[PDB]
Amino acid sequence: SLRSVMTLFSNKDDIYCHQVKIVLAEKGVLYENAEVDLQALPEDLMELNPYGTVPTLVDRDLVLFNSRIIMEYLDERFPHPPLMQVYPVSRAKDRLLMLRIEQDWYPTLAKAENGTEKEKTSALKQLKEELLGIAPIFQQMPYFMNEEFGLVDCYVAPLLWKLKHLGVEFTGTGSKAIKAYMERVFTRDSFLQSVG
Amino acid sequence: VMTLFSNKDDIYCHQVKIVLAEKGVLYENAEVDLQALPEDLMELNPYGTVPTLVDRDLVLFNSRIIMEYLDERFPHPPLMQVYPVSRAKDRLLMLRIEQDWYPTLAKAENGTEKEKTSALKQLKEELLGIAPIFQQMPYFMNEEFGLVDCYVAPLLWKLKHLGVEFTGTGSKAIKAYMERVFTRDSFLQSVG
User: Fold this and answer.
1) CB neighbour burial string for B144-160, b if at least 16 within 10 angstroms, e if fewer
2) Where in this chain does the record put each GST C-terminal domain (chain A)?
């Protein structure tokens, strides 16, 4: 592993913190985890990041927040293994895919965790239908619209992980490809470290 | 073929047009009325937002993604630094500009007459507050013109056209910055 002197301020149930921990583990970067309670933020986080958000990555004098900015920083600073492709069109398609995952699926997931009972049930059914709907994606490629594991999977895997633990179970048409993808990502060394 | 679906008054369209002009790339501007979106935009981009860029087979939206794509596809002149640390700092600047300054700018164009005059005073206040930043380097927190200036310049341009004038302390660094970015060939093309 790499002996960095980084501190990650994070919360263990936050999906954005989860994305960043997977990238840190992929890159083999050692860092200190500083757990934070969202209602009771530590003053040292406030000192470094006045917006008081997590994840916040601190490396010596550098302070970063926003998980997309953090992840691209780590991929650029620590090239191996590559979590984005090399060529500009692939990079743009992956970026657009990420934005859409975040925009379209993440709020439904949040509703599924934090809504009223009919909202939850309604959010879960909606996410379930949508994920089943994109099943054909895998008949071509083992990672999400990619041949190799990358940042897009760092958006999809935390979401599937949360759905699994909310009781979602995939059956019917498209469920074989989704279960296969889950095994492929959940069993990776980095994912194992991220939920450790 | 290269097409930008764009609205002429939209700040995010303006960002992308500056980057297109810097890279010297030819494109067709498809003007869109926000209240009546054309069908050919809807079929390429189900979300119906602008700017939307179409490059041969690739469809892109969201101005940040378009700009990064252009900077990577058309490498010179480079609009981002080379070091991962500097690139991250600039990304974070841009995020903060867009999150903290842009809503106040929208309010200054879209509000009631009370809302508008209030927003204009706030923005003018915060910009004069950071006068010593404009003082530091010729471009915004950078020695060379880059993507960060593509966030700052369109905002100052809108303000100029909303009647804002800078006088008093630090207004000198801000005016000198405006003169310097507004008179670049790429910027003059982007407003043409």
Assistant:
1) ebbbbbbbbbbbbbbbe
2) 87-196
